[PDB]
């Protein structure tokens, strides 16, 4: 299960990276 | 299957990350 | 299949993320 | 083997990238 | 084939993302 | 083969992206 588990952990982190960048864009737009 | 579902979620997050960074670039350009 | 299609979409978004970050670096240098 | 090892290293780096971007978001919000 | 080609394109974009983020860190440290 | 080599290059670039983002976070926090 190691390859499937590593891909699921990359997908969880990718979602959190997208959300943090939406918050950064909003802060910079005022 | 789990590999395809994780890769589809990474592709959706990658498109959201690209859009947020294009908004950040435009804010910093004025 | 869906695995190859998701990886082609991640490659296309990665190139857009690289371009936006090069524009952010130039804006922060003036 | 080598695919699994490289994916485990990408997952660990992705979690640190997410954490750093949450810190950047919080800094700009406050 | 197309899976190896997409991963090679992701590798090149990742290197360009790392270059740009190092430029951004240096500009903010100025 | 070529799949493992591309993933090893992605892992190395991801570690440098994490480092650069921690530098950015520290600079912004002062």
Numbering used by the authors:
A (entry chain D), B (entry chain E), C (entry chain F), D (entry chain C), E (entry chain A), F (entry chain B): 1 to 30
Copy text from the publication.
We targeted two properties of αHBs: oligomeric state, which directly affects the internal diameter of the channel; and the identities of channel-facing residues, which fine tune this dimension and introduce different chemistries. The αHBs are loaded with an environment sensitive dye (in this case, 1,6-diphenyl-1,3,5-hexatriene, DPH) that binds within the channels and fluoresces. Accordingly, challenging the array with analytes leads to differential displacement of the dye across the array to give a fluorescent fingerprint.
We introduced mutations at one or two of these sites to generate four groups of αHB: Group I had entirely hydrophobic interiors, but with different sizes and shapes of channel; Groups II and III had polar uncharged or polar charged residues, respectively, at specific points along the channel; and Group IV had aromatic residues installed in their channels. In detail, the sixteen Group I peptides included: previous designs for a pentamer, 3 hexamers, 2 heptamers and an octamer all verified by X-ray crystallography;27,29 single and/or double mutations to Ala and Gly at central a and d sites to generate larger channels; a single-Pro mutant at the final d site to kink and open the C-terminal end of the channel; and a variant with all a sites made Met to vary the hydrophobic chemistry used. Finally, one third of the designs were crystallized and yielded 12 X-ray crystal structures, all of which were open αHBs with fully accessible channels. Conversely, the FAs generate signal through interactions with the more-hydrophobic and aromatic-containing channels (Group I and IV).
